[PDB]
Amino acid sequence: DQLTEEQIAEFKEAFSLFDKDGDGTITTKELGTVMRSLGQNPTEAELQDMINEVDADGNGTIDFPEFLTMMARKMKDTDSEEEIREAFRVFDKDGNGYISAAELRHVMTNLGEKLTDEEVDEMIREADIDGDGQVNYEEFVQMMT
Amino acid sequence: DQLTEEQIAEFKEAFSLFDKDGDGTITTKELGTVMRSLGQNPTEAELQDMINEVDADGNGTIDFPEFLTMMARKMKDTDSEEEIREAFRVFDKDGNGYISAAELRHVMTNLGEKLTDEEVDEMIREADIDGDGQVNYEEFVQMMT
């Protein structure tokens, strides 16, 4: 949590990864995807105070630069804990604070070993993502096979 | 896959990993977990057929040995594809063939890095898993923090 070549360089990727359009323009919606995609849990309001924040043209689009500036500021409210607790929260479907010790084990080793961060990113790229960040999990299977 | 030492050793782990009773016997339920814990997607019937075959006393129990023998048989019946697909299915909450490109990325890298395959088992070992394998993720959160 401190703007640095790497930090930034990374922040680009995530931004590039969810700009379906293909031209540096993350939508209010694409914005959330980006953040969750980094461990943050932006509230629908929070994502709003962010669009209006800078963008005063109501274009609803966000330029990497703006994004970067935002992140930098909101970076203070990011500690290892929340990030972690979000990962595990993906495995909590019904949302009961409870998760499959199993599903965990499986996803983490089986799929955690067959793939490398870079590979995860490469897939998501060619992958067919929509606004929300949804993707037909089969697409991934076809790739991985 | 075949019954190589490593393989046996792996099954042992998983089996040991969900025999909450502390001894060397897993229940029909526990069985389910163990299997999901390895990418197998056991059907209730299948699970019952197993508890039935061996253990004619229908004790509902099953030894590592019996377990080993069993897995051996169903072994050549499962292929890498299925496991892959089951992994991804964890990420598909409402079960609509769709998952969060984000959540994937997040879980896969953030938490995919903070832990090593063993660190996972080691955690689930000390973790407070219940019958269905359910676990309070917070408990994992703490261990991590």
Curated annotation (Swiss-Prot), chains A, B:
Top-level lineage group: Eukaryota
Record GO terms (molecular function): adenylate cyclase activator activity; adenylate cyclase binding; calcium channel inhibitor activity; calcium channel regulator activity; calcium ion binding; calcium-dependent protein binding; nitric-oxide synthase binding; nitric-oxide synthase regulator activity
Free-text function comment from the UniProt entry: Calmodulin acts as part of a calcium signal transduction pathway by mediating the control of a large number of enzymes, ion channels, aquaporins and other proteins through calcium-binding. Calcium-binding is required for the activation of calmodulin. Among the enzymes to be stimulated by the calmodulin-calcium complex are a number of protein kinases, such as myosin light-chain kinases and calmodulin-dependent protein kinase type II (CaMK2), and phosphatases.
Cross-link Glycyl lysine isopeptide (Lys-Gly) (interchain with G-Cter in SUMO2) per UniProt, renumbered positions: K20
Binding site for Ca(2+) 4: D128, D130, D132, Q134, E139
Keyword Cell cycle: no
Residue sites binding Ca(2+) 3 per the record: D92, D94, N96, Y98, E103
Major subcellular location class: cytoplasm
Annotated GO biological process: autophagosome membrane docking; calcineurin-mediated signaling; cellular response to interferon-beta; cellular response to type II interferon; detection of calcium ion; establishment of protein localization to membrane; establishment of protein localization to mitochondrial membrane; G2/M transition of mitotic cell cycle
Binding site for Ca(2+) 1: D19, D21, D23, T25, E30
Keyword Ribosomal protein tagged: no
One cellular-component annotation, GO: cytosol
Free-text description of this protein's post-translational modifications in UniProt: Ubiquitination results in a strongly decreased activity.
Additional detail: This protein has four functional calcium-binding sites.
Family, as annotated: Belongs to the calmodulin family.
Protein's organism: Rattus norvegicus
Alphabetically ordered keywords of this record: Acetylation, Calcium, Cell projection, Cilium, Cytoplasm, Cytoskeleton, Flagellum, Isopeptide bond, Metal-binding, Methylation, Phosphoprotein, Repeat, Ubl conjugation
Subcellular location: Cytoplasm, Cytoskeleton, Spindle; Cytoplasm, Cytoskeleton, Spindle pole; Cytoplasm, Cytoskeleton, Microtubule organizing center, Centrosome; Cell projection, Cilium, Flagellum
Residues bearing PTM N6-methyllysine: K114
Positions bound to Ca(2+) 2: D55, D57, N59, T61, E66
Modified positions (Phosphothreonine) in chain numbering: T43, T109
Positions of modified residues (N6-acetyllysine): K20, K93
Name under which the protein is recorded: Calmodulin-1
Domain EF-hand: residue ranges: 6-41, 42-77, 79-114, 115-145
Subunit structure: Homotetramer. Interacts with CEP97, CCP110, TTN/titin and SRY. Interacts with MYO5A and RRAD. Interacts with USP6; the interaction is calcium dependent. Interacts with CDK5RAP2. Interacts with SCN5A. Interacts with RYR1. Interacts with FCHO1. Interacts with MIP in a 1:2 stoichiometry; the interaction with the cytoplasmic domains from two MIP subunits promotes MIP water channel closure. Interacts with ORAI1; this may play a role in the regulation of ORAI1-mediated calcium transport. Interacts with SYT7. Interacts with MYO10 and MYO1C.
